């Protein structure tokens, strides 16, 4: 999917896990976020500058959703274990991370 | 001053911001921080000692510092708007950004 598209699976399952109320409603946005954080590390940001794919502008964007995936990768195993409560509390501190990724293009 | 003062003019205030009471407050603790913005803003960081003031790297580092003086300012907003918990709740997300420059500079 376009870059557009993976955000928006990151935005709604952010928001899903929030109000979520079992633990299969947390791994299943949770896991629809990994491959969306996936996807559009394959994707370029389209205000970048030197969009070279060496760059490092470009090595900070890809390596930006390694740090995701492994925070994603932090909630599932909570919620792997049912603990539904802390999972939701380790998928809050992905949005600090999604922040990072904005600023650079504000 | 120098980044390392204002840097704790930024801490002190966020802390003092934290534990307020009042709208009076946290507009007293948001105009001390920014103000402690714009003169870091003047600095030049130790990692970039080497490096000149129209250097990409300087604009960046700049930058960030608007960054954050456009964020206390929409604090600032909620504060003159009575909205005392929202204006302490946007205080706490600046970390986010005192956490990026951080990332990258300091
Ligand atoms: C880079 C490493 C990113 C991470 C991590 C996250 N996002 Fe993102 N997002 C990224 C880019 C390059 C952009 C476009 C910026 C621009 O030039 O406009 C976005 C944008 C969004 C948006 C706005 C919708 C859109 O532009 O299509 C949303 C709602 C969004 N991103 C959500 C989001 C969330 C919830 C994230 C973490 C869980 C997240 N993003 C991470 C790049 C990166
Ligand atoms: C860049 C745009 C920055 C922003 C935004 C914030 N800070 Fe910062 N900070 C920055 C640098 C380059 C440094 C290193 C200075 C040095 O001489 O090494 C720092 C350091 C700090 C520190 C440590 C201070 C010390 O005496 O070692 C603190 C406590 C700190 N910064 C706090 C802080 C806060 C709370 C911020 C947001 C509200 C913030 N900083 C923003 C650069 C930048
Ligand atoms: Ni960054
Ligand atoms: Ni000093």
């Given at each position: 999917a376009d870059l557009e598209d993976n955000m928006e699976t990151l935005n709604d399952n952010l928001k899903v896990i929030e109000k979520a109320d079992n633990a299969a409603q947390v791994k299943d946005a949770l896991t629809k976020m990994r491959a969306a954080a996936l996807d559009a590390q394959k994707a370029t940001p389209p205000k970048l500058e030197d969009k070279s794919p060496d760059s490092p502008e470009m090595w900070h964007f890809r390596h930006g959703f390694?740090?995701?995936?492994?925070q994603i990768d932090d909630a599932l195993k909570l919620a792997n274990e049912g603990?539904?409560?802390?999972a939701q509390a380790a998928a809050e501190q992905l949005?600090?991370?999604c922040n990072?990724?904005?600023?650079?293009?504000?």
């Open positions: 390694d740090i995701l995936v492994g603990k539904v409560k802390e949005k600090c991370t990072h990724c904005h600023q650079h293009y504000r």
